[PDB]
């Protein structure tokens, strides 16, 4: 949901320019910076909290209740909040102005028969002058007393001139009171009251709010960030600490290369004209492009190369599956803690920052450490295979040949291409050439 030039709160309260959001539901309410308010000046104590919980519900669904205020005027309005040409006020709110020459102590009640939690948003008015107070509220001493069968809340108006805004030196304090199922709500105000027209159907969902001005293009992407959705194919990311949905861990490192292939010893002896065909040892065969491990025979019939799929496959299998195992393909998170602020709040703020920061450092370590372990481990794995296939041959060839050391076996007997092939599959038998080879060796 794009609240455009509107804050989730200005939408809740019911600001003229944000009325379009009334009865709105959402998964992730995006709050733009271009945002702003244009209604009667207000101040929400512990504002952040209220805003947070609202975003959690994920719906500004309002349900007007039939409140009955006796002996007092209703639907008050002012210029500051003009809905169209004529003045106006908050939508889900109602201004209670004195009736005639008296403001009887208003006292009503509202039960919560419904099985879902109700959220009533009210407020108190802070007169800028005594005459304004005694005029708009009769008795100069106002008082609001919202209370439920569980908690109790009482506020007192604070008369006094304050910073002029939208043409007003007055203010309105916002206060919210949740009413659990079965419980009942009560309001006993002497004046300066700003009774609501109903409540909001609070829900428990993955709904949350994120701050950003990022464009909204049509597309599907599980992860969302203040910088715009990002692919969650990788384990971590360095885009932003604030995330939503299935996103990679936010590590400090902007990059981490994981060894996927084999350790490479580039360059080649490329020995002369006639090719020694020398064993791997200190060189890889950039020529072999049909596998990871292969053989090269130098028989009387000439030269030749063939890759052993068996050995090569074992390596690949181990490599592929590992990554996903170590790191979890994904993990979801929705509403969290504000990982940013615009002003100082002392204690509370400090803690919040520490928590998040501590997380990153600890997490980053795991990533760094993990990658190092993987790469280091992969090399040994692939390098081992190459070493086994070499020993698998030693046991196979038996006496017939000798390990030159250069990574080759100097067979001591005429070996045609078929003779070689029989050794690569492993079928080859030593006795066959035993007598023959034995001679060329010790003679």
């Amino acid at each position, epitope marked *: 949901l794009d609240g455009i030039d509107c804050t989730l709160i200005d939408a809740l309260l019911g600001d003229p320019h944000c009325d379009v959001f009334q009865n709105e539901t959402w998964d992730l309410f995006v709050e733009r*910076s*271009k*945002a*702003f308010s244009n209604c009667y000046p207000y101040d929400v104590p512990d504002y952040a909290s209220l805003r947070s919980l609202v975003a959690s519900s994920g719906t500004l669904e309002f349900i007007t209740e039939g409140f009955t205020w006796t002996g007092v005027t209703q639907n008050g309005g002012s210029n500051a909040c003009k809905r169209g040409p004529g003045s106006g006020f908050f939508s889900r709110l109602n201004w209670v102005t004195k009736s005639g020459s008296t403001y009887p102590v208003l006292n009503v009640t509202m039960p919560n028969n419904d099985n879902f939690d109700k959220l009533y948003i009210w407020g108190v008015h802070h007169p800028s002058t005594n005459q304004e107070q005694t005029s708009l509220y009769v008795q100069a001493s106002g008082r609001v007393t919202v209370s439920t069968r569980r908690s109790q809340q009482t506020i007192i108006p604070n008369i006094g001139s304050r910073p002029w805004v939208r043409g007003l030196s007055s203010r309105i304090s916002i206060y919210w009171t949740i009413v659990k199922p079965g419980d009942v709500l009560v309001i006993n105000s002497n004046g300066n009251l700003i009774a609501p027209r109903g409540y909001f159907k609070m829900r428990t969902g993955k709904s949350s709010i994120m*701050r*950003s*001005d*990022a*464009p909204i293009d049509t597309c599907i992407s599980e992860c969302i960030t*203040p*910088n*715009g959705s990002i692919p969650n194919d990788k384990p971590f990311q360095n885009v*932003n600490k604030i995330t939503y949905g299935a996103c990679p861990k936010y590590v400090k490192q902007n990059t981490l290369k994981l060894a996927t292939g084999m350790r490479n010893v580039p360059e080649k002896q490329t020995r002369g004209l006639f090719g020694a065909i020398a064993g791997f040892i200190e060189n890889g065969w950039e020529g072999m492009i049909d596998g990871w491990y292969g053989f090269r025979h130098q028989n009387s019939e000439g030269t030749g190369q063939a890759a052993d799929l068996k050995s090569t496959q074992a390596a690949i299998d181990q490599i592929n599956g590992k990554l996903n195992r170590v790191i979890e393909k994904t993990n979801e998170k929705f509403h969290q803690i504000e990982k940013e602020f615009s002003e100082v709040e002392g204690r509370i703020q400090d803690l919040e920052k520490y928590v998040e920061d501590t997380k990153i450092d600890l997490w980053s370590y795991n990533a760094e450490l993990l990658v190092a372990l993987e790469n280091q481990h992969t090399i040994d794995l692939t390098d081992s295979e190459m070493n086994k296939l070499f020993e698998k041959t030693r046991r196979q060839l038996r006496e017939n040949a000798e390990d030159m050391g250069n990574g080759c076996f100097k067979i001591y007997h005429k070996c045609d291409n078929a003779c070689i092939e029989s050794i690569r599959n492993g079928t080859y038998d030593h006795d066959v050439y035993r007598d023959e080879a034995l001679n060329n060796r010790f003679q």
Partner: antibody
Amino acid sequence: QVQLVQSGAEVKKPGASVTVSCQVSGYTLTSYGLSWVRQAPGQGLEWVGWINTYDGQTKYVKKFQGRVTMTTHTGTNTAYMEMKSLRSDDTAVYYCARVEGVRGVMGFHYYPMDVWGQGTMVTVSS
Amino acid sequence: SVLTQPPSVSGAPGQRVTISCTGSSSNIGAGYAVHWYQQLPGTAPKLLISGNSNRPSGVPDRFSGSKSGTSASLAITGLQAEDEADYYCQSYDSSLSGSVFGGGTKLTVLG
């Protein structure tokens, strides 16, 4: 209802320098971006620089980099445009309009220029 | 450089005039939000149409903005006397790490 006050048209010889100032009314410039465009007499328009209040980000034309420079008085709700070692040709009308590219966006692109100023006319000649 | 725009366009009152604006592959494949600004005679420019037909408040709907392939255009219906002014197809590019502007157009209501 957002107004834009622009510094009184100025005139200075080439090699000298001038500075255009922009004021804002209503929406705080702080929650809005900004850029400047030169309007050579009947020559069309040409985007010059771009700044982002509360974001301290700046991007200039490859052509006049260094020569021009942005500034912002977050305290007085006014932006500044500095032009040093001016050039005879460079003289023209200058404007300052709102931009959406703020916060997470950073990039101007997405935002469509809104609410442009009346315009300041500087004149460079020897 | 400057986006490709027509030198001038002109039609009779109450007709449809199209202003063609083509861009470079950098702007093309990116199709970065293209906007148009109506600059009346001797007066600061204004947002005529934004975000690829995103409508500015207060501007008659007779103005529409389309975009496809390597170019986009602005259509004007029921052309009125006032409707004549200088138009520029503003956009943003990447290869130049900046925003591109339109050469210009001079709309004049026949009569």
